[PDB]
Amino acid sequence: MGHFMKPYFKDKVTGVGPPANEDTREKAAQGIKAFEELLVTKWKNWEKALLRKSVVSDRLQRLLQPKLLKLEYLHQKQSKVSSELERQALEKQGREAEKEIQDINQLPEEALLGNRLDSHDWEKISNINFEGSRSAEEIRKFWQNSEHPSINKQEWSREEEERLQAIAAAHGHLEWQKIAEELGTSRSAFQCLQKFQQHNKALKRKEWTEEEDRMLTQLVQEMRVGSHIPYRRIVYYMEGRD
Amino acid sequence: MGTPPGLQTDCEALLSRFQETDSVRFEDFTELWRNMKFGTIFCGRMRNLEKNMFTKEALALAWRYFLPPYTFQIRVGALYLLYGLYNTQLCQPKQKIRVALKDWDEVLKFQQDLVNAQHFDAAYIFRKLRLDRAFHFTAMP
Amino acid sequence: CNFPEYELPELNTRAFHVGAFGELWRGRLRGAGDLSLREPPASALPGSQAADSDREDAAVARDLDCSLEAAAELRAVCGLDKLKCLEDGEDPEVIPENTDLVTLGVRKRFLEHREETITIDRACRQETFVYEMESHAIGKKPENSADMIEEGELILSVNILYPVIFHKHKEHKPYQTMLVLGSQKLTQLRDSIRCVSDLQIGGEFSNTPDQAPEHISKDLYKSAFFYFEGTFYNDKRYPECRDLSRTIIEWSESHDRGYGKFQTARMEDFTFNDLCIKLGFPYLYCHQGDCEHVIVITDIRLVHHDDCLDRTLYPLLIKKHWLWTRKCFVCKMYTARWVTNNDSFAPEDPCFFCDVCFRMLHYDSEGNKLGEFLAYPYVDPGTFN
Amino acid sequence: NKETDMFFLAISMVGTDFSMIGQLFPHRARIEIKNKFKREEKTNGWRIDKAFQEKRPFDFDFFAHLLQKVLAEEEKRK
Amino acid sequence: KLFQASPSVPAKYVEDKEKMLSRTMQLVELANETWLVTGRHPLPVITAATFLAWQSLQPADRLSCSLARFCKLANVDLPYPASSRLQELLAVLLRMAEQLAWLRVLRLDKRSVVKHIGDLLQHRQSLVRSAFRDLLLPPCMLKSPKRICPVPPVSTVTGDENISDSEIEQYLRTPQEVRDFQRAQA
Ligand SMILES: [Zn+2]
Ligand SMILES: [Zn+2]
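A: This is the predicted complex of the input protein with zinc ion.
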């Protein structure tokens, strides 16, 4: 019974489906998205922990690779070369590279993490360290905007909330990047807007308006059968509800 | 879905008791029905959809008893149970017994046998259910 | 023979021709009036059968091969007073204690722990849609003569599963149940479905959000087809319609993919009476080139005078599953109307935004683009469910 | 264990004639008898010597019968 | 048949023939120099090397594939000791991975290492020469045998003429057992 779930037809030996159809190809060329794209999984603590591990590992390899490549090239040259003074100079270079790799080994994880806007091989991280389960750009956004330690993850202070409200009014509730910059607590535009919307009287309304009531009544009468109405789905059409 | 919680026990107890009486008369079945007071089953703070699907499944299960391989008096008791369940319901419209195509003809032959057997109580009860059109012409029960 | 049999107990049945099955049902009922759409006489208490006695006793005597006095005696014996131990005036909202039913003992056990100030309520019991649609349509008749169900017509129950699927549960399915007539063409069922995929739209509009596409997927594509008994039924009424079945035939017949030989037909060539179909066995439907639905023929029966006879409503909807609205991540409460990718402001990609949050975040008063992001208009299937 | 006791009693009865040994048991080859000897000698050289000294009367029917009975008993109880 | 987009195989598993050949060639020479080839069947080790090379050319998905699935896809009769040879090479792979700074810091494992084989091969020679100073021999006898070929006691004495005579009595049958032997195979 359960064998017939989507896709309805699936290849018996490989499980693949038919190639892209003409209608599907045109729709893709028109940029029409699919419903499967809306499926997103919550960041469990393991996902974050191994993202952190991946970032530290990436930075470690980035720092080490030039040093160890230099050391290995130097050792190859020392092995092939017979000149004594040049051999001693190459040996000294190898000792320097050894000391450099040792102090990099001794560097702390925080120094390895570096700044928020540092460069990383997000593509390689994605497809080799999480096997492509999450997209490289998605991982980049998550890290740089929420997970990197420089992000202000602390709870909002009451003074911070009051100043946020005041400067949001000052900025006309627009350009929330400038709002966050003026707040001065290293907050992001998205954090500021989410916070304001969660305590904005204009969005969440206890009162009512003529257009909201009219459209609620219209949708209710069009859809309602007996006692049932889409209480929480009417919110798509009118603004300021659940 | 299956069966309501406890309905199977009440139905089997009623059918077993009616069998042990060794009587096919409808008087005995109604007397048991009134004594243990089966008709309350359609009360008890069950709402509209609840009465509808409870009656549907109860009628389907009463039909399950009404079918073979159980012998004459068991099927007679099951028909009396079908009559009671349908005529003591409070649905609007009265919900119908789901009966299969494969079962309509066999029940018609059973009604004819009841007529030939001169036990006209069961045949009359089936005809009364037919007048109520208490049954739905379905492919499966 | 077209004799329905269980292929798996209470799960699915063998295949049979709908027309032949309906003809067999009518043959077992034609001329008896049991399949008629006209109100028959009903049972009553023995104290009120005097008016009905003249009409009933003679017919009973004729059918049961018993005397008129025997018919009257049977009627008195089978009086509802012998079974109506509830008075017609008793409310159903209370369990009557004068009973020995185990069922009502269980009902009492259920109700007792629901009378505290925290638990007492008259809320939904387990579902709502079914009875609402029933009471909205049951027993009604059409306002037009041409919209009347034929007496003894077949009623088919068809379930269509939603494109959005749980992927974590398998006992239950997300579906909507329709009722269709034997004589109806499949064109009506194809045209009736209001699937959200028809509302699908595309295009990237971060620079100019107000320039959303003028055409929904329904206005650009019309390819749709049904799948029964190995047959494709593709629509070709319009130039936008394409016979999707040809590509899948080419793909599948070239290799042992686990399915047999297939053949193509149009959508308007068949009525519900022309199909040879199973009950409970899953089947397939598709539209928009890619939006596949699972089709299950849950039930089939002749029409009854108590059923909905108003064909203006047909195809009928009688049961509907639920999908959760896609709430935008900014306020986490309001429903999203926009989604962005590559968005520097957004903490995650993709990020969904409401029409309120989207504009006020990504644009200034003039509507100029702010930051780096790509934005797409979004239609919520959890809303248009 | 009981099968070990059987090789010991057999080789008491008849000596170390692995061919006749393997014939009388139903599914044991001469190679199996040799391998069993090579395994057991280290701990049961005393028992092999006792068996060589134990020139027990080798009756055909008696031993065939007691075999069949004790194989049946072991199979049932095992 | 891994290198053509046949209908029976997904295109996911098509590569460059020369890259595959080079990966497998360098893996095979590594196995050779690590004493994994002498006195044994080459076909299982070669098969293992091919499987690991193919996996390493895209660890993203091939890490989920099994060698049994591999031979099914390729229509190849896998030798029974292929799994054992693969395990041996994996142990050698971990012994090699311990050498490099990044790998040893990352604390890799038998499975996750699949995505660094090219890196290892890049610096094979120096690292393996360093690792040898810690050789390979049959793992069965690498169990740290504290005693090797112990000298047996000298028992070259053969007596003078006869050390005992009851042995003949012990090795001869009594007349009872003689009759018993006669009736044994009647
Ligand atoms: Zn759809
Ligand atoms: Zn908003």
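The radius of gyration of chain D is 12 Å. Chain D is about 80% helix and 0% strand.
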